[PDB]
């Protein structure tokens, strides 16, 4: 399903063009602005290992973070910076842009590919 669709059709939004972060816009957002680095960002997300085997969501209980400030994995700083208010996007992320060969046990194993659906609710300029 969704992870394989992002493999097949997703845009490579990396600078290096290494397919490390692939994106599909699922629902289009409003406004020309996207978050600049330093912004306070508000999202709903659903995430999982691409294997399907572990699963994690804000809409369970929004997730708040400062963009570009190392509170989230590199792929979120990259991916969320491309998104507009109201946008829902799918990301598929190689380990180099997430938790790498070290992983982050017990939640994330070594060399894990991650999938997220993200909704950008708001962002405000520090
Ligand atoms: C590697 O550890 C975790 C990874 C992820 C979720 C984690 C987590 O903690 C063990 O618990 C979610 C709730 C806790 C209190 N928490 C942690 C963070 N923010 N809230 C810190 C953010 C670190 O996570 C990230 O950078 C990314 C992007 C933002 C949303 C969470 N992220 C994750 O990688 C999840 C992960 C998704 C894949 C399935 C397992 C959970």
mmCIF file of N, CA and C and ligand atoms in Angstrom:
data_model
loop_
_atom_site.group_PDB
_atom_site.id
_atom_site.type_symbol
_atom_site.label_atom_id
_atom_site.label_comp_id
_atom_site.label_asym_id
_atom_site.label_seq_id
_atom_site.Cartn_x
_atom_site.Cartn_y
_atom_site.Cartn_z
ATOM 1 N N UNK A 1 0.839 -1.199 0.000
ATOM 2 C CA UNK A 1 0.000 0.000 0.000
ATOM 3 C C UNK A 1 0.871 1.244 0.000
ATOM 4 N N UNK A 2 0.704 2.074 1.042
ATOM 5 C CA UNK A 2 1.146 3.448 0.976
ATOM 6 C C UNK A 2 2.666 3.485 0.850
ATOM 7 N N UNK A 3 3.459 2.755 1.658
ATOM 8 C CA UNK A 3 4.916 2.841 1.527
ATOM 9 C C UNK A 3 5.418 2.479 0.123
ATOM 10 N N UNK A 4 4.867 1.402 -0.443
ATOM 11 C CA UNK A 4 5.255 0.972 -1.770
ATOM 12 C C UNK A 4 4.841 2.030 -2.817
ATOM 13 N N UNK A 5 3.667 2.675 -2.663
ATOM 14 C CA UNK A 5 3.248 3.764 -3.543
ATOM 15 C C UNK A 5 4.274 4.909 -3.500
ATOM 16 N N UNK A 6 4.852 5.213 -2.320
ATOM 17 C CA UNK A 6 5.779 6.326 -2.209
ATOM 18 C C UNK A 6 7.109 5.935 -2.860
ATOM 19 N N UNK A 7 7.530 4.686 -2.694
ATOM 20 C CA UNK A 7 8.674 4.157 -3.435
ATOM 21 C C UNK A 7 8.509 4.413 -4.941
ATOM 22 N N UNK A 8 7.328 4.085 -5.467
ATOM 23 C CA UNK A 8 7.067 4.030 -6.908
ATOM 24 C C UNK A 8 6.872 5.428 -7.514
ATOM 25 N N UNK A 9 6.150 6.311 -6.786
ATOM 26 C CA UNK A 9 5.679 7.569 -7.320
ATOM 27 C C UNK A 9 6.199 8.798 -6.592
ATOM 28 N N UNK A 10 6.887 8.608 -5.455
ATOM 29 C CA UNK A 10 7.209 9.753 -4.637
ATOM 30 C C UNK A 10 8.290 10.613 -5.277
ATOM 31 N N UNK A 11 8.239 11.916 -4.952
ATOM 32 C CA UNK A 11 9.284 12.869 -5.342
ATOM 33 C C UNK A 11 10.479 12.788 -4.375
ATOM 34 N N UNK A 12 11.713 12.802 -4.889
ATOM 35 C CA UNK A 12 12.912 12.813 -4.078
ATOM 36 C C UNK A 12 13.178 14.255 -3.677
ATOM 37 N N UNK A 13 12.929 14.579 -2.407
ATOM 38 C CA UNK A 13 13.056 15.968 -1.978
ATOM 39 C C UNK A 13 14.414 16.202 -1.290
ATOM 40 N N UNK A 14 15.384 15.303 -1.476
ATOM 41 C CA UNK A 14 16.714 15.477 -0.885
ATOM 42 C C UNK A 14 17.549 16.390 -1.775
ATOM 43 N N UNK A 15 18.517 17.092 -1.173
ATOM 44 C CA UNK A 15 19.490 17.908 -1.897
ATOM 45 C C UNK A 15 20.446 17.031 -2.694
ATOM 46 N N UNK A 16 20.895 15.948 -2.076
ATOM 47 C CA UNK A 16 21.830 15.020 -2.696
ATOM 48 C C UNK A 16 21.161 14.171 -3.777
ATOM 49 N N UNK A 17 19.833 14.141 -3.840
ATOM 50 C CA UNK A 17 19.143 13.290 -4.813
ATOM 51 C C UNK A 17 19.574 11.831 -4.622
ATOM 52 N N UNK A 18 19.494 11.366 -3.378
ATOM 53 C CA UNK A 18 19.842 9.996 -3.039
ATOM 54 C C UNK A 18 18.597 9.176 -2.714
ATOM 55 N N UNK A 19 17.413 9.700 -3.012
ATOM 56 C CA UNK A 19 16.137 9.065 -2.684
ATOM 57 C C UNK A 19 15.981 8.787 -1.189
ATOM 58 N N UNK A 20 16.605 9.607 -0.331
ATOM 59 C CA UNK A 20 16.572 9.352 1.099
ATOM 60 C C UNK A 20 15.248 9.750 1.753
ATOM 61 N N UNK A 21 14.569 10.698 1.129
ATOM 62 C CA UNK A 21 13.312 11.231 1.597
ATOM 63 C C UNK A 21 12.453 11.388 0.338
ATOM 64 N N UNK A 22 11.402 10.569 0.249
ATOM 65 C CA UNK A 22 10.442 10.561 -0.852
ATOM 66 C C UNK A 22 9.089 10.998 -0.320
ATOM 67 N N UNK A 23 8.362 11.793 -1.144
ATOM 68 C CA UNK A 23 7.175 12.511 -0.730
ATOM 69 C C UNK A 23 6.071 12.348 -1.761
ATOM 70 N N UNK A 24 4.838 12.088 -1.295
ATOM 71 C CA UNK A 24 3.628 12.330 -2.069
ATOM 72 C C UNK A 24 2.736 13.283 -1.286
ATOM 73 N N UNK A 25 2.204 14.296 -1.978
ATOM 74 C CA UNK A 25 1.204 15.154 -1.384
ATOM 75 C C UNK A 25 -0.106 14.385 -1.480
ATOM 76 N N UNK A 26 -0.791 14.177 -0.366
ATOM 77 C CA UNK A 26 -2.065 13.466 -0.397
ATOM 78 C C UNK A 26 -3.228 14.450 -0.388
ATOM 79 N N UNK A 27 -3.141 15.528 0.399
ATOM 80 C CA UNK A 27 -4.151 16.573 0.367
ATOM 81 C C UNK A 27 -3.467 17.946 0.328
ATOM 82 N N UNK A 28 -3.903 18.796 -0.598
ATOM 83 C CA UNK A 28 -3.221 20.056 -0.859
ATOM 84 C C UNK A 28 -3.558 21.055 0.254
ATOM 85 N N UNK A 29 -2.525 21.830 0.632
ATOM 86 C CA UNK A 29 -2.631 22.834 1.678
ATOM 87 C C UNK A 29 -3.061 24.201 1.140
ATOM 88 N N UNK A 30 -3.212 25.170 2.059
ATOM 89 C CA UNK A 30 -3.578 26.545 1.716
ATOM 90 C C UNK A 30 -2.347 27.425 1.966
ATOM 91 N N UNK A 31 -2.121 28.414 1.087
ATOM 92 C CA UNK A 31 -1.160 29.490 1.298
ATOM 93 C C UNK A 31 0.158 29.207 0.579
ATOM 94 N N UNK A 32 0.900 30.278 0.245
ATOM 95 C CA UNK A 32 2.174 30.192 -0.468
ATOM 96 C C UNK A 32 3.333 29.872 0.500
ATOM 97 N N UNK A 33 3.196 30.222 1.790
ATOM 98 C CA UNK A 33 4.271 30.098 2.768
ATOM 99 C C UNK A 33 4.482 28.627 3.147
ATOM 100 N N UNK A 34 5.746 28.209 3.293
ATOM 101 C CA UNK A 34 6.088 26.962 3.966
ATOM 102 C C UNK A 34 6.988 27.312 5.145
ATOM 103 N N UNK A 35 7.167 26.438 6.154
ATOM 104 C CA UNK A 35 7.942 26.811 7.326
ATOM 105 C C UNK A 35 9.423 27.077 7.010
ATOM 106 N N UNK A 36 9.925 28.228 7.480
ATOM 107 C CA UNK A 36 11.339 28.541 7.482
ATOM 108 C C UNK A 36 11.944 27.863 8.712
ATOM 109 N N UNK A 37 13.266 27.671 8.692
ATOM 110 C CA UNK A 37 13.960 27.109 9.836
ATOM 111 C C UNK A 37 13.732 28.015 11.040
ATOM 112 N N UNK A 38 13.530 27.399 12.199
ATOM 113 C CA UNK A 38 13.311 28.144 13.432
ATOM 114 C C UNK A 38 11.836 28.225 13.836
ATOM 115 N N UNK A 39 10.928 28.057 12.878
ATOM 116 C CA UNK A 39 9.495 28.093 13.132
ATOM 117 C C UNK A 39 9.065 27.078 14.188
ATOM 118 N N UNK A 40 7.969 27.389 14.890
ATOM 119 C CA UNK A 40 7.338 26.452 15.808
ATOM 120 C C UNK A 40 6.252 25.770 14.996
ATOM 121 N N UNK A 41 6.327 24.438 14.878
ATOM 122 C CA UNK A 41 5.493 23.708 13.928
ATOM 123 C C UNK A 41 4.542 22.740 14.648
ATOM 124 N N UNK A 42 3.305 22.665 14.143
ATOM 125 C CA UNK A 42 2.222 21.886 14.731
ATOM 126 C C UNK A 42 1.704 20.867 13.716
ATOM 127 N N UNK A 43 1.779 19.568 14.053
ATOM 128 C CA UNK A 43 1.359 18.525 13.114
ATOM 129 C C UNK A 43 0.486 17.467 13.794
ATOM 130 N N UNK A 44 -0.299 16.777 12.962
ATOM 131 C CA UNK A 44 -0.756 15.428 13.247
ATOM 132 C C UNK A 44 0.056 14.482 12.367
ATOM 133 N N UNK A 45 0.418 13.327 12.903
ATOM 134 C CA UNK A 45 1.106 12.322 12.108
ATOM 135 C C UNK A 45 0.676 10.911 12.531
ATOM 136 N N UNK A 46 0.854 9.993 11.582
ATOM 137 C CA UNK A 46 0.871 8.554 11.812
ATOM 138 C C UNK A 46 2.173 8.019 11.231
ATOM 139 N N UNK A 47 2.956 7.284 12.024
ATOM 140 C CA UNK A 47 4.226 6.757 11.526
ATOM 141 C C UNK A 47 4.290 5.242 11.736
ATOM 142 N N UNK A 48 5.205 4.589 11.040
ATOM 143 C CA UNK A 48 5.450 3.168 11.244
ATOM 144 C C UNK A 48 6.768 2.826 10.571
ATOM 145 N N UNK A 49 7.407 1.735 11.017
ATOM 146 C CA UNK A 49 8.426 1.049 10.237
ATOM 147 C C UNK A 49 7.778 0.629 8.910
ATOM 148 N N UNK A 50 8.516 0.733 7.802
ATOM 149 C CA UNK A 50 7.972 0.421 6.486
ATOM 150 C C UNK A 50 7.506 -1.033 6.389
ATOM 151 N N UNK A 51 8.137 -1.910 7.156
ATOM 152 C CA UNK A 51 7.742 -3.287 7.447
ATOM 153 C C UNK A 51 6.329 -3.406 8.029
ATOM 154 N N UNK A 52 5.714 -2.303 8.501
ATOM 155 C CA UNK A 52 4.392 -2.327 9.107
ATOM 156 C C UNK A 52 4.409 -2.669 10.600
ATOM 157 N N UNK A 53 5.573 -3.010 11.190
ATOM 158 C CA UNK A 53 5.587 -3.871 12.376
ATOM 159 C C UNK A 53 5.475 -3.089 13.688
ATOM 160 N N UNK A 54 5.825 -1.789 13.703
ATOM 161 C CA UNK A 54 5.557 -0.881 14.824
ATOM 162 C C UNK A 54 4.875 0.379 14.282
ATOM 163 N N UNK A 55 4.024 1.033 15.080
ATOM 164 C CA UNK A 55 3.065 2.035 14.620
ATOM 165 C C UNK A 55 2.931 3.127 15.687
ATOM 166 N N UNK A 56 2.828 4.410 15.314
ATOM 167 C CA UNK A 56 2.872 5.496 16.290
ATOM 168 C C UNK A 56 2.146 6.722 15.738
ATOM 169 N N UNK A 57 1.284 7.348 16.549
ATOM 170 C CA UNK A 57 0.442 8.426 16.043
ATOM 171 C C UNK A 57 0.173 9.514 17.084
ATOM 172 N N UNK A 58 0.230 10.780 16.659
ATOM 173 C CA UNK A 58 -0.286 11.879 17.457
ATOM 174 C C UNK A 58 -1.814 11.795 17.589
ATOM 175 N N UNK A 59 -2.545 11.589 16.467
ATOM 176 C CA UNK A 59 -4.014 11.596 16.523
ATOM 177 C C UNK A 59 -4.496 10.551 17.536
ATOM 178 N N UNK A 60 -3.581 9.730 18.105
ATOM 179 C CA UNK A 60 -3.898 8.906 19.269
ATOM 180 C C UNK A 60 -4.245 9.805 20.448
ATOM 181 N N UNK A 61 -3.408 10.812 20.761
ATOM 182 C CA UNK A 61 -3.746 11.737 21.849
ATOM 183 C C UNK A 61 -4.184 13.086 21.245
ATOM 184 N N UNK A 62 -1.849 17.401 19.169
ATOM 185 C CA UNK A 62 -0.872 17.559 18.045
ATOM 186 C C UNK A 62 0.557 17.591 18.573
ATOM 187 N N UNK A 63 1.476 17.171 17.701
ATOM 188 C CA UNK A 63 2.899 17.118 17.965
ATOM 189 C C UNK A 63 3.520 18.450 17.560
ATOM 190 N N UNK A 64 4.305 18.995 18.503
ATOM 191 C CA UNK A 64 4.849 20.338 18.364
ATOM 192 C C UNK A 64 6.363 20.239 18.326
ATOM 193 N N UNK A 65 7.020 20.951 17.399
ATOM 194 C CA UNK A 65 8.479 20.989 17.374
ATOM 195 C C UNK A 65 8.969 22.246 16.650
ATOM 196 N N UNK A 66 10.243 22.595 16.870
ATOM 197 C CA UNK A 66 10.880 23.711 16.182
ATOM 198 C C UNK A 66 11.624 23.154 14.980
ATOM 199 N N UNK A 67 11.362 23.715 13.801
ATOM 200 C CA UNK A 67 11.920 23.177 12.573
ATOM 201 C C UNK A 67 13.419 23.494 12.497
ATOM 202 N N UNK A 68 14.202 22.470 12.137
ATOM 203 C CA UNK A 68 15.623 22.586 11.857
ATOM 204 C C UNK A 68 16.499 22.588 13.103
ATOM 205 N N UNK A 69 15.980 22.163 14.263
ATOM 206 C CA UNK A 69 16.626 22.413 15.540
ATOM 207 C C UNK A 69 16.979 21.082 16.202
ATOM 208 N N UNK A 70 17.009 20.016 15.388
ATOM 209 C CA UNK A 70 17.355 18.677 15.839
ATOM 210 C C UNK A 70 16.432 18.076 16.903
ATOM 211 N N UNK A 71 15.145 18.466 17.001
ATOM 212 C CA UNK A 71 14.211 17.778 17.895
ATOM 213 C C UNK A 71 13.585 16.575 17.158
ATOM 214 N N UNK A 72 13.668 16.562 15.819
ATOM 215 C CA UNK A 72 13.141 15.466 15.038
ATOM 216 C C UNK A 72 14.226 14.981 14.082
ATOM 217 N N UNK A 73 13.979 13.832 13.439
ATOM 218 C CA UNK A 73 14.905 13.269 12.483
ATOM 219 C C UNK A 73 15.021 14.214 11.290
ATOM 220 N N UNK A 74 16.182 14.138 10.611
ATOM 221 C CA UNK A 74 16.571 14.979 9.496
ATOM 222 C C UNK A 74 15.446 14.989 8.446
ATOM 223 N N UNK A 75 14.808 13.838 8.181
ATOM 224 C CA UNK A 75 13.771 13.724 7.153
ATOM 225 C C UNK A 75 12.568 14.598 7.497
ATOM 226 N N UNK A 76 12.297 14.843 8.785
ATOM 227 C CA UNK A 76 11.170 15.676 9.132
ATOM 228 C C UNK A 76 11.528 17.137 8.869
ATOM 229 N N UNK A 77 12.763 17.529 9.181
ATOM 230 C CA UNK A 77 13.178 18.900 8.970
ATOM 231 C C UNK A 77 13.129 19.180 7.470
ATOM 232 N N UNK A 78 13.610 18.233 6.673
ATOM 233 C CA UNK A 78 13.550 18.336 5.219
ATOM 234 C C UNK A 78 12.104 18.367 4.726
ATOM 235 N N UNK A 79 11.329 17.346 5.125
ATOM 236 C CA UNK A 79 10.016 17.126 4.543
ATOM 237 C C UNK A 79 8.998 18.183 4.969
ATOM 238 N N UNK A 80 8.983 18.487 6.270
ATOM 239 C CA UNK A 80 8.000 19.417 6.791
ATOM 240 C C UNK A 80 8.272 20.813 6.222
ATOM 241 N N UNK A 81 9.541 21.158 5.936
ATOM 242 C CA UNK A 81 9.845 22.453 5.351
ATOM 243 C C UNK A 81 9.227 22.617 3.960
ATOM 244 N N UNK A 82 8.913 21.517 3.248
ATOM 245 C CA UNK A 82 8.265 21.582 1.938
ATOM 246 C C UNK A 82 6.737 21.727 2.000
ATOM 247 N N UNK A 83 6.107 21.703 3.176
ATOM 248 C CA UNK A 83 4.657 21.533 3.257
ATOM 249 C C UNK A 83 3.940 22.855 3.568
ATOM 250 N N UNK A 84 2.709 23.007 3.072
ATOM 251 C CA UNK A 84 1.846 24.153 3.361
ATOM 252 C C UNK A 84 0.848 23.823 4.476
ATOM 253 N N UNK A 85 0.384 24.865 5.188
ATOM 254 C CA UNK A 85 -0.682 24.778 6.183
ATOM 255 C C UNK A 85 -1.869 24.032 5.572
ATOM 256 N N UNK A 86 -2.265 22.934 6.227
ATOM 257 C CA UNK A 86 -3.408 22.146 5.799
ATOM 258 C C UNK A 86 -2.991 20.944 4.947
ATOM 259 N N UNK A 87 -1.717 20.866 4.572
ATOM 260 C CA UNK A 87 -1.256 19.821 3.672
ATOM 261 C C UNK A 87 -1.173 18.509 4.451
ATOM 262 N N UNK A 88 -1.567 17.433 3.763
ATOM 263 C CA UNK A 88 -1.223 16.085 4.200
ATOM 264 C C UNK A 88 -0.272 15.474 3.174
ATOM 265 N N UNK A 89 0.829 14.923 3.684
ATOM 266 C CA UNK A 89 1.825 14.308 2.821
ATOM 267 C C UNK A 89 2.244 12.937 3.365
ATOM 268 N N UNK A 90 2.701 12.055 2.463
ATOM 269 C CA UNK A 90 3.315 10.792 2.805
ATOM 270 C C UNK A 90 4.828 10.915 2.574
ATOM 271 N N UNK A 91 5.616 10.509 3.574
ATOM 272 C CA UNK A 91 7.064 10.417 3.474
ATOM 273 C C UNK A 91 7.529 8.981 3.655
ATOM 274 N N UNK A 92 8.505 8.603 2.835
ATOM 275 C CA UNK A 92 9.234 7.354 2.982
ATOM 276 C C UNK A 92 10.704 7.706 3.093
ATOM 277 N N UNK A 93 11.317 7.238 4.206
ATOM 278 C CA UNK A 93 12.594 7.727 4.676
ATOM 279 C C UNK A 93 13.623 6.604 4.881
ATOM 280 N N UNK A 94 14.784 6.726 4.216
ATOM 281 C CA UNK A 94 15.886 5.774 4.330
ATOM 282 C C UNK A 94 16.595 5.997 5.654
ATOM 283 N N UNK A 95 17.322 5.005 6.196
ATOM 284 C CA UNK A 95 17.900 5.168 7.544
ATOM 285 C C UNK A 95 18.865 6.351 7.675
ATOM 286 N N UNK A 96 19.596 6.695 6.617
ATOM 287 C CA UNK A 96 20.487 7.846 6.667
ATOM 288 C C UNK A 96 19.751 9.144 7.063
ATOM 289 N N UNK A 97 18.434 9.255 6.855
ATOM 290 C CA UNK A 97 17.720 10.488 7.188
ATOM 291 C C UNK A 97 16.804 10.270 8.397
ATOM 292 N N UNK A 98 17.047 9.150 9.110
ATOM 293 C CA UNK A 98 16.284 8.843 10.295
ATOM 294 C C UNK A 98 17.243 8.410 11.402
ATOM 295 N N UNK A 99 17.340 7.111 11.723
ATOM 296 C CA UNK A 99 18.109 6.696 12.923
ATOM 297 C C UNK A 99 19.340 5.854 12.579
ATOM 298 N N UNK A 100 19.603 5.680 11.265
ATOM 299 C CA UNK A 100 20.918 5.229 10.794
ATOM 300 C C UNK A 100 21.196 3.769 11.161
ATOM 301 N N UNK A 101 22.473 3.423 11.159
ATOM 302 C CA UNK A 101 22.891 2.061 11.454
ATOM 303 C C UNK A 101 22.829 1.797 12.959
ATOM 304 N N UNK A 102 22.828 2.847 13.786
ATOM 305 C CA UNK A 102 22.749 2.658 15.223
ATOM 306 C C UNK A 102 21.333 2.270 15.652
ATOM 307 N N UNK A 103 20.352 2.815 14.917
ATOM 308 C CA UNK A 103 18.957 2.685 15.285
ATOM 309 C C UNK A 103 18.672 3.423 16.598
ATOM 310 N N UNK A 104 17.550 3.049 17.220
ATOM 311 C CA UNK A 104 17.084 3.682 18.421
ATOM 312 C C UNK A 104 16.194 2.697 19.162
ATOM 313 N N UNK A 105 16.821 1.638 19.669
ATOM 314 C CA UNK A 105 16.118 0.535 20.308
ATOM 315 C C UNK A 105 15.491 0.994 21.627
ATOM 316 N N UNK A 106 14.403 0.329 22.078
ATOM 317 C CA UNK A 106 13.808 -0.780 21.326
ATOM 318 C C UNK A 106 12.851 -0.387 20.201
ATOM 319 N N UNK A 107 12.526 0.895 20.072
ATOM 320 C CA UNK A 107 11.524 1.318 19.098
ATOM 321 C C UNK A 107 11.992 1.138 17.665
ATOM 322 N N UNK A 108 13.224 1.565 17.337
ATOM 323 C CA UNK A 108 13.688 1.565 15.965
ATOM 324 C C UNK A 108 14.898 0.652 15.824
ATOM 325 N N UNK A 109 14.874 -0.325 14.894
ATOM 326 C CA UNK A 109 16.035 -1.183 14.692
ATOM 327 C C UNK A 109 17.100 -0.535 13.807
ATOM 328 N N UNK A 110 18.257 -1.206 13.706
ATOM 329 C CA UNK A 110 19.322 -0.696 12.879
ATOM 330 C C UNK A 110 18.817 -0.639 11.428
ATOM 331 N N UNK A 111 19.167 0.419 10.715
ATOM 332 C CA UNK A 111 18.972 0.476 9.277
ATOM 333 C C UNK A 111 17.479 0.431 8.875
ATOM 334 N N UNK A 112 16.606 1.113 9.616
ATOM 335 C CA UNK A 112 15.176 1.020 9.406
ATOM 336 C C UNK A 112 14.743 2.075 8.382
ATOM 337 N N UNK A 113 13.900 1.632 7.447
ATOM 338 C CA UNK A 113 13.082 2.495 6.622
ATOM 339 C C UNK A 113 11.760 2.837 7.330
ATOM 340 N N UNK A 114 11.456 4.132 7.431
ATOM 341 C CA UNK A 114 10.265 4.681 8.099
ATOM 342 C C UNK A 114 9.283 5.264 7.071
ATOM 343 N N UNK A 115 7.993 5.189 7.419
ATOM 344 C CA UNK A 115 6.868 5.780 6.682
ATOM 345 C C UNK A 115 6.082 6.694 7.632
ATOM 346 N N UNK A 116 5.769 7.883 7.162
ATOM 347 C CA UNK A 116 4.838 8.727 7.893
ATOM 348 C C UNK A 116 3.789 9.328 6.972
ATOM 349 N N UNK A 117 2.603 9.514 7.554
ATOM 350 C CA UNK A 117 1.616 10.452 7.035
ATOM 351 C C UNK A 117 1.629 11.636 7.995
ATOM 352 N N UNK A 118 1.835 12.823 7.435
ATOM 353 C CA UNK A 118 1.874 14.052 8.210
ATOM 354 C C UNK A 118 0.836 15.049 7.712
ATOM 355 N N UNK A 119 0.099 15.619 8.675
ATOM 356 C CA UNK A 119 -0.732 16.791 8.439
ATOM 357 C C UNK A 119 -0.114 18.003 9.137
ATOM 358 N N UNK A 120 0.124 19.032 8.342
ATOM 359 C CA UNK A 120 0.636 20.299 8.843
ATOM 360 C C UNK A 120 -0.528 21.187 9.271
ATOM 361 N N UNK A 121 -0.664 21.391 10.580
ATOM 362 C CA UNK A 121 -1.812 22.137 11.098
ATOM 363 C C UNK A 121 -1.482 23.627 11.137
ATOM 364 N N UNK A 122 -0.289 23.952 11.663
ATOM 365 C CA UNK A 122 0.072 25.357 11.809
ATOM 366 C C UNK A 122 1.598 25.476 11.870
ATOM 367 N N UNK A 123 2.126 26.677 11.614
ATOM 368 C CA UNK A 123 3.491 27.012 11.998
ATOM 369 C C UNK A 123 3.592 28.512 12.266
ATOM 370 N N UNK A 124 4.340 28.885 13.309
ATOM 371 C CA UNK A 124 4.440 30.273 13.728
ATOM 372 C C UNK A 124 5.929 30.600 13.808
ATOM 373 N N UNK A 125 6.270 31.836 13.430
ATOM 374 C CA UNK A 125 7.643 32.286 13.343
ATOM 375 C C UNK A 125 8.156 32.671 14.715
ATOM 376 N N UNK A 126 9.014 31.823 15.313
ATOM 377 C CA UNK A 126 9.669 32.089 16.591
ATOM 378 C C UNK A 126 9.569 33.588 16.963
HETATM 379 C C1 LIG B 1 13.096 7.241 18.594
HETATM 380 O O1 LIG B 1 12.103 7.380 19.598
HETATM 381 C C2 LIG B 1 10.814 7.595 19.177
HETATM 382 C C3 LIG B 1 10.411 7.627 17.849
HETATM 383 C C4 LIG B 1 9.089 7.900 17.516
HETATM 384 C C5 LIG B 1 8.161 8.096 18.520
HETATM 385 C C6 LIG B 1 8.554 8.078 19.841
HETATM 386 C C7 LIG B 1 9.880 7.805 20.186
HETATM 387 O O2 LIG B 1 10.291 7.827 21.497
HETATM 388 C C8 LIG B 1 10.537 6.551 22.093
HETATM 389 O O3 LIG B 1 7.659 8.285 20.862
HETATM 390 C C9 LIG B 1 6.517 9.145 20.594
HETATM 391 C C10 LIG B 1 6.101 9.824 21.879
HETATM 392 C C11 LIG B 1 7.335 10.188 22.778
HETATM 393 C C12 LIG B 1 7.050 10.735 24.220
HETATM 394 N N1 LIG B 1 8.159 11.104 21.963
HETATM 395 C C13 LIG B 1 9.420 10.925 21.548
HETATM 396 C C14 LIG B 1 9.715 11.990 20.743
HETATM 397 N N2 LIG B 1 8.626 12.795 20.706
HETATM 398 N N3 LIG B 1 7.673 12.249 21.434
HETATM 399 C C15 LIG B 1 11.017 12.329 20.088
HETATM 400 C C16 LIG B 1 10.998 12.422 18.565
HETATM 401 C C17 LIG B 1 11.875 11.398 17.883
HETATM 402 O O4 LIG B 1 11.042 10.998 16.767
HETATM 403 C C18 LIG B 1 11.233 11.579 15.582
HETATM 404 O O5 LIG B 1 12.100 12.361 15.345
HETATM 405 C C19 LIG B 1 10.202 11.102 14.567
HETATM 406 C C20 LIG B 1 9.500 12.296 13.934
HETATM 407 C C21 LIG B 1 8.553 13.045 14.863
HETATM 408 C C22 LIG B 1 7.514 12.061 15.375
HETATM 409 C C23 LIG B 1 8.164 10.836 16.059
HETATM 410 N N4 LIG B 1 9.252 10.179 15.232
HETATM 411 C C24 LIG B 1 9.531 8.847 15.235
HETATM 412 O O6 LIG B 1 10.538 8.389 14.638
HETATM 413 C C25 LIG B 1 8.638 7.903 16.056
HETATM 414 C C26 LIG B 1 8.649 6.471 15.456
HETATM 415 C C27 LIG B 1 7.965 6.355 14.087
HETATM 416 C C28 LIG B 1 8.107 4.963 13.521
HETATM 417 C C29 LIG B 1 7.406 3.960 14.390
HETATM 418 C C30 LIG B 1 7.979 4.048 15.767
HETATM 419 C C31 LIG B 1 7.945 5.470 16.372
#
